Design a protein around this ligand. Structure first.
Ligand SMILES: [Mn+2]
Ligand SMILES: [Mn+2]
Ligand SMILES: [Zn+2]
Ligand SMILES: [Zn+2]
Ligand SMILES: [Zn+2]
Ligand SMILES: [Zn+2]
Lengths: 162, 162
DNA sequence: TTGACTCTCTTAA
DNA sequence: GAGAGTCA
DNA sequence: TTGACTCTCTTAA
DNA sequence: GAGAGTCA
């Protein structure tokens, strides 16, 4: 809610509940031929999810609390960042998974950044493969690699130059 | 159904028309601190665009030809690839700008690949900065860099480990 | 047959 | 990646 | 008050 | 990144 005290209380309640979510170990590519280990705190697949949590989409959840007799609700991954600016350079800040695991609610796996920065982590070579993200990636992005392009640049005639 | 010859005729008329678009010289980052030059063949900002072309959205156009009394229409950047497979790994192929300039219709600046491959080029370090795309990028992606993350991973208590 | 507009849709964060 | 409503 | 569902929306390719 | 309709 409005007060800093009320916001800290929301973060603390969220952390306590999420801290009881099952811890699932995931081994992940780091780039550079190296592998690391992440510990994701994963929300259950089906109800009940935990005090204050409810599913609004197959991979979307919301956290809700009643403060001053009013219900307040947030996207389930946005709660760690309730004291942060909600925009940057005129772009909305999003919760962004460094582990690329939507069910995970480990705040040590989340950052707060534009949707473009968020998306771009999908292709990052990773913390041992050349990641240049200022807030460093925890793993190589799942879509990093040569791609599967079907056809490259081409012309039939002689009208074009690169 | 249009024959191969008819499709080739469509590609040829498209190239003839696009080759007469204004050619704009752009200096671009290649990665590795190097700069290069790309020559984009840019569709006009407003009608008329060129024979067969019409705008269906702010940054969307279509190419239309009538053959044996039947109207055929294609996305304006898909025409170079009409003789190519239209899906790969169960994913639809998309026209993908290597120059990241939607107005450009230079077929030497286009490739044909999944939407994920397409998007990921936005963050590529570029052909002189470590590009691993099998069909190589022509330039560093416009969104490459450290990003502007507002808040990093953090916890208030001690409930979590990375 | 052609131009110049109109509308809505896909994907995965 | 999001917000908000309907029921019990 | 809390839980478990429902729906549609945003963005930029 | 897409497909399709209307009107003259
Ligand atoms: Mn993400
Ligand atoms: Mn693109
Ligand atoms: Zn995680
Ligand atoms: Zn990174
Ligand atoms: Zn171009
Ligand atoms: Zn590349």
């Amino acid at each position: 809610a409005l007060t800093n005290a009320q916001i800290l209380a929301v973060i603390d309640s969220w952390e306590e509940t999420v801290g009881q979510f099952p811890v699932i170990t995931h081994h992940v590519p780091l780039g550079g031929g190296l592998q690391g280990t992440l510990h994701c705190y994963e929300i259950p697949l089906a109800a009940p999810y935990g005090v204050g949590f409810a599913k609004n989409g197959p991979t979307r959840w919301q956290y809700k609390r009643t403060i001053n007799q009013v219900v307040h609700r947030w996207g389930s991954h946005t709660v760690p960042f309730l004291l942060e600016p909600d925009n940057i350079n005129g772009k909305t800040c999003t919760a962004s998974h460094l582990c690329h695991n939507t069910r995970c609610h480990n705040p040590l796996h989340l950052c707060w950044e534009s949707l473009d920065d968020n998306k771009g982590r999908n292709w990052c070579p990773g913390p041992n493969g050349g990641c240049v993200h200022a807030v460093v990636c925890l793993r190589q992005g799942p879509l990093y690699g040569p791609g599967a392009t079907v056809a490259g640049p081409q012309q039939r005639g002689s009208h074009f130059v690169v």
